[PDB]
């Protein structure tokens, strides 16, 4: 059908993109990837990738979205049909990300529910779930003594199993919250995306205010300086291994949400002649600034913990996804009336999480209904379809709130939508646009839309820098391979690793497969067959 919507204002676009960027990918994921790799060694690859590839590819996503009014899949039909598989990859990635991204908000909701109490559970271990090795941090400094802030997590929230092979029972208490978050999601999406006026004034400022409060409460602590010194000092020995490179490289593709159908979908709602360049750059500044600032909040608390307990900074906390839930509650414990701030912190996490969720769920739905705008037209069809996707998302996410859930969540976070797939997708996107479709032709298109050509930084970042970086990391990872491990002490069975590589391949293979499907489906000799598909069609 001819109909296609557009933004009511440029502020709608800016708000939607700002909601899509800033979320748990900055305040939760970045700290533990930095901690796992020993602090300051992580920053050099981080900024090299940032300014070499990250921002140009984000601008490419937005401007492709704006040039051709279509979602993740149906624009490559108008850039280069032969390579259309990239959109199917870009939608599989979103489908897998939405499965596991909700579980963090499930845990946040459980903490919020536990928060409303006369005394915080993780303040003192008189409770039943704790081991006899428990000692309060005030006394742990005076051989296996452990802290209550860690025991609450592991023994009550996770109820952690001794291994992935031992799933145990499903924690109904967490399952009800996992369902509640999906109810909240549905009753926002089932109408449509909108800014809704005054609600944005509160939603868009409270979380940053709370983050600033957390930063100030963090730096004030007795041991912050040692944490910062650990944070900012590169250990060059670490750069000799591929992991510190690929984790830093893929963290940026994850944070900017560029290898996903979302950003293109958001771009597609703009007017053709709209100038987006400055907004893209300033929002990239916002994203990377917030991510960088959060480190001073985390590692100051970790240095305080190491100073109080008397251990090395690298030994003090979990080298895994629990780091934020171990760190911030320990800081919340250090303020008057802890219940107030405990409430506010998890409200802040929920507000940061909901926005990103809504934006990319809407992006997935937008990218998929454009395949069948008639069969899945407006009406009851959307009502059925959205639930048909969300219910399967719920029953898939349910697999990892069991007693063995954490070992599966780690496997998802390492392989699904957060690793090599992003390098693959970004390499092929840049390769297509630069070398097949033509950098000159695309620069002329950008000139026609914006009024000014993109310039050297974008041109060479697409043509040379990004492909070379993506090839280098991809080769370096496999010539110096090392297997995955949980919390730096747990080794995965071969079947778990095989499942992880299967999960990643399910995303990667869409690119080469669709090429064969398209090519075998066209008549005539192959040299004419490829010529028909290398030309814009729709």
């Amino acid at each position, epitope marked *: 059908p001819p109909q296609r919507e557009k933004w009511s204002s440029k502020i709608d676009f800016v708000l939607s993109v700002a909601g899509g960027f800033v979320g748990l990918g900055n305040v939760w994921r970045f700290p533990y990837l930095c901690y796992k790799n020993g602090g300051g060694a992580f920053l050099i690859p981080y900024f090299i990738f940032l300014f070499g590839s990250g921002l140009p590819v984000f601008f490419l996503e937005i401007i492709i979205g704006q040039y051709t009014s279509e979602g993740g899949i149906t624009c490559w039909e108008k850039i280069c049909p032969l390579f259309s598989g990239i959109g199917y990859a870009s939608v599989v990635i979103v489908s897998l990300l939405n499965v596991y991204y909700i579980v963090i908000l499930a845990w946040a909701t459980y903490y919020l529910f536990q928060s409303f109490q006369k005394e915080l559970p993780w303040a003192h271990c008189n409770h039943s779930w704790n081991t006899p090795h428990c000692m309060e941090d005030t006394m742990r400094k005076n051989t296996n003594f452990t802290s209550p802030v860690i025991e609450f997590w592991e023994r009550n929230v996770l109820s952690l199993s001794p291994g992935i092979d031992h799933p145990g029972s499903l924690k109904w208490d967490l399952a009800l919250c996992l369902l509640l978050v999906w109810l909240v999601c549905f009753f926002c999406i089932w109408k449509g995306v909108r800014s809704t006026g005054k609600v944005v004034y509160f939603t868009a400022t409270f979380p940053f205010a709370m983050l600033l409060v957390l930063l100030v409460r963090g730096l004030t602590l007795p041991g912050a300086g040692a944490g910062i010194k650990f944070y900012l000092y590169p250990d060059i020995t670490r750069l000799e291994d591929p992991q510190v490179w690929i984790d830093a490289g893929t963290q940026i593709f994850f944070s900017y949400a560029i290898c996903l159908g979302a950003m293109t979908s958001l771009g597609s709602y703009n007017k053709y002649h709209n100038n987006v360049y400055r907004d893209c750059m300033l929002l990239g500044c916002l994203n990377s600034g917030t991510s960088f600032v959060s480190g001073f909040a985390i590692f100051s608390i970790l240095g305080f913990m190491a100073q109080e307990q008397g251990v090395d900074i690298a030994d003090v906390a979990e080298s895994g996804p629990g780091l934020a839930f171990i760190a911030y509650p320990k800081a919340v414990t250090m303020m008057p009336l802890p219940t107030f701030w405990s409430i506010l912190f998890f409200i802040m996490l929920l507000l940061l999480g909901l926005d990103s969720q809504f934006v990319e769920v809407e992006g997935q739905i937008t990218s998929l209904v454009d395949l069948y705008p008639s069969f899945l037209r407006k009406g009851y069809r959307r009502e059925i379809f959205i639930a048909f996707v969300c219910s399967i998302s719920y029953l898939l996410g349910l697999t990892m709130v069991t007693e063995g859930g954490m070992y599966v969540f780690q496997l998802f976070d390492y392989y699904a939508a957060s690793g090599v797939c992003l390098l693959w997708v970004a390499f092929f996107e840049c390769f297509v646009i630069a070398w097949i479709y033509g950098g000159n032709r695309f*620069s*002329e298109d950008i*000139r*026609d839309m914006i*009024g*000014f*050509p993109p310039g050297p930084w974008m041109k060479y970042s697409w043509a040379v820098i990004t492909p070379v970086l993506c090839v280098g990391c991809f080769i370096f990872s496999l010539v110096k391979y090392v297997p995955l491990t949980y919390n730096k002490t747990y080794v995965y069975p071969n079947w778990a690793i095989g499942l992880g590589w299967s999960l990643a391949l399910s995303s990667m293979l869409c690119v080469p497969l669709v090429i064969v499907i398209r090519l075998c489906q066209t008549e005539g000799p192959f040299l004419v067959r490829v010529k028909y598909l290398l030309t814009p069609r729709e």
Partner: antibody
Amino acid sequence: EVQLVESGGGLVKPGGSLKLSCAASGFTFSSYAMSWVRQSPEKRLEWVAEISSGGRYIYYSDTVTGRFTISRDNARNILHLEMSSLRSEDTAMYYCARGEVRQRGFDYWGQGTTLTVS
Amino acid sequence: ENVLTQSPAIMSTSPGEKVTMTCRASSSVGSSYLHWYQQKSGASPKLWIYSTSNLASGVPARFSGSGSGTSYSLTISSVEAEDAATYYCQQFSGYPLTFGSGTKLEM
């Protein structure tokens, strides 16, 4: 450094046809977008047409959209304008302008050539 | 077609004063898409001001512009000899491109 010089122009019968050209030097002519602008004997400026770097995108003024054609010769750094039916209102001096970036205007102009109709 | 109207038909000035030229649009135009040009009598124009206040490569820097939305202006801090010319305001946000009626400074 940069140079622009138009050629062609003269007396023609009303309803006749004439072809103007604009040679360029001193810059990578394949990159910069080009436009034509004409000045009436009343000294009023009027925009005519624009053509993009690769000639893929072309725009026309409303009062000439049916009679004028704009084209390029990138291999020899020459710009062409072809007119099909010159009414009495078409007499003017035609300028050749290198307006690449829309946020920065027409930074270079040619000398221009006159066109008149009997 | 977004027509631009310039207020003063013509100006004559002694070399001891400052003046302002007004350019008014039929529809609002962004600040990044209005430029002013110089035309010396008997010669082809040249770019004078762009993006509503940025000064061209050789303009005497006594020139400055200000405005937004529907109305714009060009101002001269101090007029002087050899400043005589015809100045046009031009819209560049959308097609067709339009030039103002232009105004001439003499005397």
